Design a protein around this ligand. Structure first.
Ligand SMILES: NC(=O)c1ccc[n+]([C@@H]2O[C@H](COP(=O)([O-])OP(=O)(O)OC[C@H]3O[C@@H](n4cnc5c(N)ncnc54)[C@H](OP(=O)(O)O)[C@@H]3O)[C@@H](O)[C@H]2O)c1
Ligand SMILES: NC(=O)c1ccc[n+]([C@@H]2O[C@H](COP(=O)([O-])OP(=O)(O)OC[C@H]3O[C@@H](n4cnc5c(N)ncnc54)[C@H](OP(=O)(O)O)[C@@H]3O)[C@@H](O)[C@H]2O)c1
Ligand SMILES: COc1cc(NCc2cc3cc(Cl)ccc3[nH]c2=O)ccc1C#N
Ligand SMILES: COc1cc(NCc2cc3cc(Cl)ccc3[nH]c2=O)ccc1C#N
Lengths: 413, 411
């Protein structure tokens, strides 16, 4: 009696995450749930094999079936082109997908009692989202060769008066300059995703900006969030004993470091990249970072780990050496995905399993069975020895055993 | 008694004014004679002068080169109606940078008994930002609807103008903005960062997002490699250190797994302590120093990265016990004097500047500190009164330890 899972769009990936991804399906997922799976290999060979079309096709499956679970993919730089002999430097799959689906990406660390956090006292979860990976990806930048006047202009499409804003008047040398933009359409999406992520998770929501300085730019993020909230989300927030409030980023950081957690943060940063966030990097185990892509309708969810393909470990695997790669984030991609499926289907057996799997993963670590990065968090890297951790299979085997027990006992009721 | 020479001083506001005068009295004036050129950068003095006193303070730093600044009230719509201000005056620190050029760094004083966010960080990590980041150089506006936003360059020459597409709003509006940076700003920023790394004896690293802003940030990066290979390259090799560029993604992840011990030039939009996670995670903003350096090498103005500690000031006003950490403020003075000692080559003053930091540190390593610092070790919930000293007790204990340290030197 396997569980009837329903329609899920799976997306296979590259390197160490592919290798693990399979272990998850075989050892933790398929022995218990029969899915109407809709796989899409997005490993770099096949993306190149199809001219990055398989990426676009997965994005459309996700729209239709409302549930995606994606493995980590190689985004090609120059050296990967030469390494796989690619036809061209294909765009990052994650951006391709999120452009098609609209909506917003939220990351969150998985927190275990026996794993130190930067801030002890952070005990309820911190869930942060950025506006389409950041304001930097919508920047038009160039060098100013010599003296002169840089300006920005609005050209009403109808054809009423132009308006010109002097940016700077370079009077005695060169420099650099750039323009940045955001569409209302897009800010509204960010709003709806954030509010609806908050209702779904049950915590309150904070929008941070720098509207002391960017009065009109960050202003209009605030006013849009406020109009949308006051017009269509307040009653449902009140009903969950939660709220939305805008903060100055200055205020918002000071609070969040003096807090216990349990909130949604809509950061209006310039850079949304995980790899440049000091706190995310500071936990000291990127393998405990989940992500989720929520769309402005509330139905459509795509889940995935926030780390990369772990190329450094992958090269060791190929040469047949020990690896201690952390599967958690990838495991939680499946459980968040499956959980949301269950939400849409009103499928209590799936919801139980999903939660169960998340539960066991933390429990397993808390008993003191874990991968090297987590032991390193406990003891310190120079102090870690081989008998403090399990390799990638030993930890996956352990999670299988503990999952068997959990569900076997849990059945008796 | 040790004559220092000329220093420039700007008296501050609220809790920092009180803490200032105590440092002057107990720590500075009994050990050292000075030619204090003092400006009253309290809010109420500025309003009386129509902000002009801030200018005078700044221009005076030009002549003498050493400044020590007490935290100051930067007005706001409630601070206006609090003092009936003639106008909502601008930030003093800004006016002072604006007038001196220069690049503001920020350090956090560390002790062996005060947990850092990362245990492994056992050396200083000094961060500078390019003129407070490019949000203060931004020009924002609302887009009412469908239409084009174009950024254009009209050469002074008169040669053909250039025009890049920012975005064409097809359906509905949004927002737009453009920011700039003159090359001279960047040369200064780089110069300041090369001088700062040379004095503090640590390697340098510049962070950018040149994988997305290939031109804008790339430009920063070259001016850094150019000026390095040109003017400073072999001076580093002489002091056994090095300069390198790091993609911001790479820099952050390298830092957080390092032992500290480097200068960091952050090319950023927001160079405000308030919004820095890592600075607000230490626990005591009372431990965060900040030092303005100029390109020319000659000019240094020190202060505290924390504000005026208003919540503590209101407790001062009512006779209620306060526990305000003065280290940053002490370090404003030691930085100012250790610099003045290198200008004057005044060895006697140099020793005093290093003496007072070692004392400040030793006191806290010994286990005598303020409430913030106690909270970092135990947790604010677990903190008993017996765990820490109040504003006054901590001073007297430093004053005491300063006296004893100075004595043993003579011998
Ligand atoms: N959406 C995505 O799928 C996504 C996101 C980011 C990057 N990537 C791609 O993945 C490839 C590799 O990128 P990268 O090496 O920069 O990033 P990465 O895969 O996150 O690896 C960086 C380092 O972090 C540690 N780490 C990350 N995940 C871990 C895990 N699950 N368990 C244990 N340790 C872990 C490892 O450090 P130690 O080796 O020191 O243990 C690893 O070398 C690139 O082609 C990149 O474009 C993909
Ligand atoms: N250097 C400058 O010129 C500068 C920099 C920032 C702000 N300001 C100005 O000064 C005011 C800032 O006040 P603010 O309350 O916003 O920020 P703040 O005075 O720097 O600090 C606010 C809180 O931080 C803690 N704190 C700061 N310094 C401390 C110390 N030395 N010892 C112990 N705790 C300390 C206190 O927390 P607890 O209350 O929890 O103990 C305090 O309530 C504003 O009017 C602003 O315009 C000036
Ligand atoms: C509950 O523990 C965590 C939660 C996390 N959530 C994600 C996150 C939080 C976050 C919080 C702030 Cl104040 C600033 C930037 C941030 N960036 C992030 O990506 C990350 C790390 C830990 C730790 N330790
Ligand atoms: C030696 O430990 C410290 C040094 C500090 N230096 C100042 C500073 C560091 C810093 C480091 C990063 Cl990775 C990011 C932003 C940062 N902003 C800062 O203002 C601050 C805190 C601690 C701690 N714990």
């Amino acid at each position: 009696k396997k569980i009837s899972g329903g329609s899920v769009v799976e997306m296979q990936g590259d390197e160490m995450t592919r290798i693990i991804w399979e272990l998850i399906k075989e050892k933790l997922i398929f022995p218990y749930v029969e899915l109407d799976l809709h796989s899409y290999d997005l490993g770099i060979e096949n993306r190149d094999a199809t001219n990055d079309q398989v990426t676009k096709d997965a994005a459309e499956a996700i729209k239709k079936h409302n549930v995606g679970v994606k493995c980590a993919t190689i985004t090609p730089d120059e050296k990967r082109v030469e390494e796989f002999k690619l036809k061209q430097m294909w765009k990052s799959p994650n951006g391709t997908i999120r452009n098609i689906l609209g909506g917003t990406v939220f990351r969150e660390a998985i927190i275990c009692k026996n794993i130190p956090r930067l801030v002890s006292g952070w005990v309820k979860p911190i869930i942060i989202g950025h506006h389409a990976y950041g304001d930097q990806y919508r920047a038009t930048d160039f060098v100013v060769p010599g003296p002169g006047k840089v300006e920005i202009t609005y050209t009403p499409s109808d054809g009423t008066q132009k308006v010109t804003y002097l940016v700077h008047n370079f009077e005695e040398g060169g420099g650099v300059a750039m323009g940045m933009y955001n569409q209302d359409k897009s800010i509204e999406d960010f709003a709806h995703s954030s509010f609806q992520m908050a209702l779904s998770k049950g915590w309150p929501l904070y929008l941070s900006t720098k509207n002391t300085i960017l009065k009109k730019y960050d202003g209009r993020f605030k006013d849009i969030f406020q109009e949308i909230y006051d017009k269509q989300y307040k009653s449902q927030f009140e009903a969950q004993k939660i709220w939305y409030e805008h903060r100055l980023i200055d205020d918002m950081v000071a609070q969040a470091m003096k807090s216990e957690g349990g909130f949604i943060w809509a950061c209006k940063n310039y850079d949304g990249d995980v790899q440049s966030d000091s706190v995310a990097q500071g936990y000291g185990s990127l393998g405990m970072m989940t992500s989720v892509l929520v769309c402005p309708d509330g139905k459509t969810v795509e889940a995935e780990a926030a780390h990369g393909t772990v190329t450094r470990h992958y090269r060791m695997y190929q040469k047949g050496q020990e690896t201690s790669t952390n599967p958690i984030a990838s495991i939680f991609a499946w459980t968040r995905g499956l959980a949301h499926r269950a939400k849409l289907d009103n499928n209590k057996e799936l919801a139980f399993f999903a939660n169960a799997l998340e539960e066991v993963s933390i429990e397993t670590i808390e008993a003191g069975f874990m991968t090297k990065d987590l032991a390193a968090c406990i003891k310190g890297l120079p102090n870690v020895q081989r008998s403090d951790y399990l390799n990638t299979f030993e930890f996956m085997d352990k999670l299988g055993e503990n999952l068997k027990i959990k569900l076997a006992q849990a059945k008796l009721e």
